[PDB]
Design a protein around this ligand. Structure first.
Ligand code: HEM
Length: 137
């Protein structure tokens, strides 16, 4: 289930974080307008850049924490607040997060692996809700 999925992802987090993030950027190309530095680069080019590997792992490090602290796929309000009030997210709307989680769910559904994709879908929607509550547009 969800909890084990957290453990699975953590067991190879750099690889999962990059593959999921790339799935997100490839599905929603318009989203690269939040990451100018990634434009015009193939997946392999991105994976070899320093800031890509570093930023994305750090994203998933915290995502997994937020996931881990959730109850029944409902994140802590404190965690939602943190994500909203991060300077690096000044721009974002919940739509950005929505898309990330659609790609994440899609990735999991197409993997050979018995991820609990329905729980990640709930998690994504509940985080979006919590981010709305904590003040993100
Ligand atoms: C649960 C979801 C997410 C978590 C946990 C998260 C977490 C983080 C963290 C920890 C950083 C700092 C990384 C660093 O600079 O070392 C970061 C930076 C950033 N996040 Fe998020 N993030 C999430 C979703 C998103 C989404 C959906 C977007 C845009 C669609 C986004 C855009 C950014 C940008 C633009 C930066 C910094 C600039 C860059 O390095 O590209 N984040 N995020």
């Amino acid at each position: 289930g969800f909890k084990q999925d957290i453990a699975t992802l953590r067991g190879d987090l750099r690889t999962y974080a990059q593959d999921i993030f790339l799935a997100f950027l490839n599905k929603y190309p318009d989203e690269k307008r939040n990451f100018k530095n990634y434009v015009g680069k193939s997946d392999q080019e991105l994976k070899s850049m320093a800031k890509f590997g570093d930023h994305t792992e750090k994203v998933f490090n915290l995502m997994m924490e937020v996931a881990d602290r959730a109850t029944d796929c409902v994140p802590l309000a404190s965690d939602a607040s943190t994500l909203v009030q991060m300077k690096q997210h000044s721009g974002l709307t919940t739509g950005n997060f929505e898309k990330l989680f659609v790609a994440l769910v899609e990735y999991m559904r197409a993997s050979g692996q018995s991820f609990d994709s329905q729980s990640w879908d709930r998690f994504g929607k509940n985080l979006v809700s919590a981010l709305s509550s904590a003040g993100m547009k």
